Design a protein around this ligand. Sequence first.
Ligand code: NAD
Ligand code: NAD
Ligand code: NAD
Ligand code: NAD
Ligand code: G3H
Ligand code: G3H
Ligand code: G3H
Ligand code: G3H
Ligand code: CL
Ligand code: CL
Ligand code: CL
Ligand code: CL
Ligand code: CL
Lengths: 333, 334, 335, 334
Amino acid sequence: MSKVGINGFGRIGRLVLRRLLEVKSNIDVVAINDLTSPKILAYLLKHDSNYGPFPWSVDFTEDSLIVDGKSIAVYAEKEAKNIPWKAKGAEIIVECTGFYTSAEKSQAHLDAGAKKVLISAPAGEMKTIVYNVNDDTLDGNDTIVSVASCTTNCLAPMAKALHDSFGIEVGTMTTIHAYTGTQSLVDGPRGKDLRASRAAAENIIPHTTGAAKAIGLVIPELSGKLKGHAQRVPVKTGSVTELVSILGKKVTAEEVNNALKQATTNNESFGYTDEEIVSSDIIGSHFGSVFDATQTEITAVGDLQLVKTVAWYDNEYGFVTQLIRTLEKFAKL
Amino acid sequence: SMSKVGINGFGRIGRLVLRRLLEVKSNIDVVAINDLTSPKILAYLLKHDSNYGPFPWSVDFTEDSLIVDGKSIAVYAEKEAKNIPWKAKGAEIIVECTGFYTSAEKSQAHLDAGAKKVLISAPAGEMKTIVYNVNDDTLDGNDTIVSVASCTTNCLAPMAKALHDSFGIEVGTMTTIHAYTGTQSLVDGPRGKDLRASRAAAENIIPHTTGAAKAIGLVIPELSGKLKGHAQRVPVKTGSVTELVSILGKKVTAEEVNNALKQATTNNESFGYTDEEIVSSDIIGSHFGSVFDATQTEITAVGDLQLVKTVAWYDNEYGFVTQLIRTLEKFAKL
Amino acid sequence: ASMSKVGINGFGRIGRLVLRRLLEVKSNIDVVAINDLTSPKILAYLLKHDSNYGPFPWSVDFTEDSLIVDGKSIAVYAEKEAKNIPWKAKGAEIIVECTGFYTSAEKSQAHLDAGAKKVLISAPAGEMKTIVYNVNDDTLDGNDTIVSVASCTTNCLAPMAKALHDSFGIEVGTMTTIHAYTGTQSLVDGPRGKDLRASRAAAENIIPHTTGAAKAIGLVIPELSGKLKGHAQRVPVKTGSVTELVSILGKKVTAEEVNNALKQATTNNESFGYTDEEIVSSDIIGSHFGSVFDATQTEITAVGDLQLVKTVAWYDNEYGFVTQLIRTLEKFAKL
Amino acid sequence: SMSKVGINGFGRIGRLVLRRLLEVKSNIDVVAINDLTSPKILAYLLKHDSNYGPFPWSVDFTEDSLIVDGKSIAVYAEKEAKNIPWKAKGAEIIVECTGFYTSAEKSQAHLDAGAKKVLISAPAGEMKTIVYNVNDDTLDGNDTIVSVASCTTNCLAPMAKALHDSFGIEVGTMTTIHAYTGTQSLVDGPRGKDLRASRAAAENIIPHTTGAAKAIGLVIPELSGKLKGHAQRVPVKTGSVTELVSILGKKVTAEEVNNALKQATTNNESFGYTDEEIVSSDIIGSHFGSVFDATQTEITAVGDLQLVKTVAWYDNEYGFVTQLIRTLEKFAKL
Ligand SMILES: NC(=O)c1ccc[n+]([C@@H]2O[C@H](COP(=O)([O-])OP(=O)(O)OC[C@H]3O[C@@H](n4cnc5c(N)ncnc54)[C@H](O)[C@@H]3O)[C@@H](O)[C@H]2O)c1
Ligand SMILES: NC(=O)c1ccc[n+]([C@@H]2O[C@H](COP(=O)([O-])OP(=O)(O)OC[C@H]3O[C@@H](n4cnc5c(N)ncnc54)[C@H](O)[C@@H]3O)[C@@H](O)[C@H]2O)c1
Ligand SMILES: NC(=O)c1ccc[n+]([C@@H]2O[C@H](COP(=O)([O-])OP(=O)(O)OC[C@H]3O[C@@H](n4cnc5c(N)ncnc54)[C@H](O)[C@@H]3O)[C@@H](O)[C@H]2O)c1
Ligand SMILES: NC(=O)c1ccc[n+]([C@@H]2O[C@H](COP(=O)([O-])OP(=O)(O)OC[C@H]3O[C@@H](n4cnc5c(N)ncnc54)[C@H](O)[C@@H]3O)[C@@H](O)[C@H]2O)c1
Ligand SMILES: O=C[C@H](O)COP(=O)(O)O
Ligand SMILES: O=C[C@H](O)COP(=O)(O)O
Ligand SMILES: O=C[C@H](O)COP(=O)(O)O
Ligand SMILES: O=C[C@H](O)COP(=O)(O)O
Ligand SMILES: [Cl-]
Ligand SMILES: [Cl-]
Ligand SMILES: [Cl-]
Ligand SMILES: [Cl-]
Ligand SMILES: [Cl-]
């Protein structure tokens, strides 16, 4: 299988294409489904507010995109069951619309003639993969798999290293997170979520995330031991996750940091920095998560000890690089 | 005399319509609201405003209503206007603020649904179109559907009218540097067919079409076909400014243009004047439709060839709403 | 009827709102003098036009050496060094110190040398009486001459910590505040003292930032010295900020139980408010509280007998902090 | 030799100057940098850029130097240019990017400090002022202090040149909608005597004077006195756009203007062309001084009279910098 369809050519969907081409994958994107014309998807692909001009040629026809000389079909089917995946033989669907985050929903891509589905979001009780953490759990028999959220790919490698070195007995996270398409431009209805209805570029907005609640799926031993949430803020991309943990051993900052450095060495998914970076330095990062040793903090009072560890993430591109790693491997089995 | 109002589209404009009605202690009585959501969500949005802060009156809700300052207001959720039960509470004048009924053909559905008149908060083609204190004397008892044009029109028109009256505008072109609005996009993604509107509004200067100058003839007939213009949408949440570059009908100095504008703003509740070094946030919550800024006036001349740039600020949300309400209160007494 | 005469040093974001708040509440204090680094014209323009709070609610004019505010004169000086400020010329006896450059006993001493009697500093100023109104203002007496009101963050954190302490005990905790950007940061990438992160464009980044609010909490709640640490993340909102605290408390608790203890702590408490509405930061702008506890963000995380407790409070680091500074100033001035 | 360069002001422009020189593999050799801080801090700023991302070469520092791509650059901290020890490493041409030496009299100080020539990164009064590919042919061997004018001059000049050559410009006025810069304020507070410059830059539309139009005569002598203009500073970090409204010497169509402009941009490394529906973030990183935008051309005509609006984008940081470097590469070989 090296024949891929993208459902939802949005922020994540367009970067999936950018990244496959950046690394010369032997995967060919042959079809795209969205809700618009080829002309509009081409304008969007060619001109990116966050990452600049497309590095390759982009043109269109009435029913297709021409990207670096290759034709890619464009469909506009609102319901995934009606998508002609069979037409160009789309074998693996990268599902990035947000409207098919379950086994039962992404089932419709199978019923429309696809073999597998990789969902770019948490998708309930299914095999959920952070690359370089639990991707060894994938087999030939898997059809519909999830890569969880940007936050889950940030949190998990940091949690994994802490759990391996020290044990995490209990923990809570806060991610300070760039605003996304789920939020609003101006104050107005955004389904049931009251907070999501508020102008995203003019507010700090508390926001639910299951990254920590559903970490059980990626790190089985931490199942039900983490909770967390987000504060969405007015940066366009680039985020950071703080974890506060009661660990299984007394530790020093240097000790926590050395252990993290160890876990990041020749680790293409998980980086390290000892530099005084800010969110914009993470934009275009090729990691899922970059641990920041400068923000490590140990608060100790006797027996009791709280350990704050902080990792950066490019929630768009960084998360994507993880999505592509997982995709390449899903596609070889 | 016609005191009972329905609001269709309880959005940025619709919410502030109510805020401004209560602020001026109008005898107009908002009896019903229609939108696409629950009373709970509307009540949340009404209490809490990112641009203007906490609502100055109490806000609660029921399964089917808002309770604002102790007074009950019915809430309906009908997406097609012809199905709004305006008769239940005797809603007579509908303030149409959804963006989806911007023509006589479309807004007449409120009449079908049992209302008496419609005031549309946006341009709506070739119909009676009013900028208060510019052409509100053209209203009469036979007007049943009326437009107040756009924020931009309520800014430009009084500046243009003043220049028309004192000097003549032979030809001109407008550019408005305008706050982003809910028609734009939060992140890069499709936004109908307008390519530019697909781009992240808070992270970009975005060129944007607007008919304010194009359709000025509806408000000042003698300027019909003599102006063009466009917008540059920028990352401020509200507050905007309009520059007009004109060939006037007479040779002028900057001091002469400013005195003529000052005279037009004197005792004019719709049209302010300033020569303070203000910036956009100083216009947020303005009670004018337009505020002429004398500090930005510029005369460029070479022999007989003269270009005149005049500039006016406007709070495209609340300030425009003050005009909307002035127009509503007159409409209702006809 | 006590009419203390006040001078303001540093007519900045905080200094200006101090005057705004004093007139807003009709305080008996008269502000008789202001010192900054500029002309009365520039100070008048800034007082009149405010990007966060809108137009000044009172008339503002200037002469070559004064502001005229609602028809009252306020002398204007421009003395880089506080010892040269002529506070005696208009009888200014209580200086509200808001420049950032006199944050110690030894430095603010200069206001007394120059003829003032008391100084209240609008920031942490080391080992000195450090007041969060409605937490420890009863430590104030007639013998105090130089006092601090700590930071905005201390004024957010201390009431929430106080109530948790009083109700449950806190064994240990750690704080993160997601904080509006301020004048100590940069507009564009460029040198800002010695703090590398402060050099980066404030409106375009999440910027980690050290704050002493947790570390020095003991000056305000002595039982908690050494028990808390924390830091900030600076983000692109112009004002309005939120403080999270992750605590191990000395009792097992539920969320409801935590939220009820906080509610009771906020009852008839002019300094410390409560919400259970789904507010966001722009809803805190213009708050008349130093801190507003948010019941909606309370989180208990539990395994066996291990419980982590997250509590969260909003604050307008500008106006809200200023209401606290003014309460503290009214009491300080009457002693 | 004249291949050895010092940078005064290692700021937004100073650092991108070094970035650009390395990017085009110039045989210019930056031997010295002066600013007001430590090499630690300069190294941190060069390595990590909020607008352009990570520096593409290595950066380390010592107590008195930077090491950029393995090459040592001396760092001084002399707030008065007369005291900068340029002779120590033999800096002959100074790229003056502080903003504090924007006159012949002031930049003379670099020559008394032992340098041979100064290139000022801003307007600087009546001295030879260069927009590359408009009037770089005017530089000669004897010039010791020159200007590259502003970002806005580099954007306006080539558009005005093309219009001037093809149709004549009788008179015209300009408005640039311009990214905020370091002369503005993060929070409301004193900023010298420009009142508007004291207002929070990322929360306002802020009008602002610029000499781009007024001083155009230095770059295109025939347009001396024929243009005026100003800016509206808005909340984007870099990337700007310039609109010019002109009375031309001929009657024209939109297509005719667009084709003339397209001709002037053909094989022009300094002056780009687009007919794509771009927005400001699309110009960030541009290797042009100016990119004419055909999509925004507008002809407003009534009988005999005509106004023509033409629009060009520019990356006021990197794009302007690319013109500065073209000019410096010629300057160094005269
Ligand atoms: N942006 C992030 O930071 C981020 C990070 C990790 C994961 N994700 C996840 O990836 C998914 C996509 O997020 P995004 O940021 O790219 O969203 P987006 O809104 O930018 O993109 C959604 C795209 O899907 C299209 N679409 C919507 N409904 C559709 C349908 N029924 N059929 C076909 N196309 C449809 C839209 O037109 C749009 O192009 C979401 O599930 C999100 O939770 C997002
Ligand atoms: N925001 C401005 O600056 C501004 C200024 C002047 C005029 N206007 C005009 O006012 C109108 C409203 O603008 P807005 O900014 O308040 O938009 P908005 O998106 O904030 O509000 C639209 C509201 O109408 C609701 N709505 C959408 N479709 C509906 C339907 N079929 N039936 C009932 N409700 C529906 C939405 O749920 C929302 O509450 C538009 O025509 C706009 O052009 C806007
Ligand atoms: N969020 C907040 O802004 C906030 C909250 C709580 C406490 N504080 C504290 O209050 C103090 C002021 O903060 P700000 O935000 O008002 O700063 P600011 O920069 O807005 O104001 C400082 C003012 O002091 C002037 N100044 C500088 N040095 C001076 C000197 N030697 N003499 C006289 N005037 C001088 C400046 O011209 C400016 O007007 C700081 O100590 C700060 O930590 C700030
Ligand atoms: N940023 C733009 O958009 C832009 C575009 C075109 C031209 N310019 C011009 O280029 C020049 C620099 O602009 P910038 O945006 O890089 O400014 P900036 O504030 O980022 O850079 C100024 C640099 O000079 C240093 N400095 C200040 N005074 C000094 C002194 N006496 N001696 C040595 N160093 C000193 C500062 O520390 C800083 O590193 C200005 O003249 C400006 O007009 C700027
Ligand atoms: O731009 C982003 C999407 O619509 C939502 O992504 P999210 O699920 O990460 O909030
Ligand atoms: O949908 C939200 C706004 O109404 C759009 O306002 P606008 O029509 O002025 O762009
Ligand atoms: O100049 C001082 C700043 O305006 C205030 O910032 P701070 O509250 O971070 O100290
Ligand atoms: O600090 C200097 C500013 O960055 C320069 O830009 P400007 O002079 O074009 O405002
Ligand atoms: Cl037009
Ligand atoms: Cl517009
Ligand atoms: Cl600490
Ligand atoms: Cl001019
Ligand atoms: Cl400018």
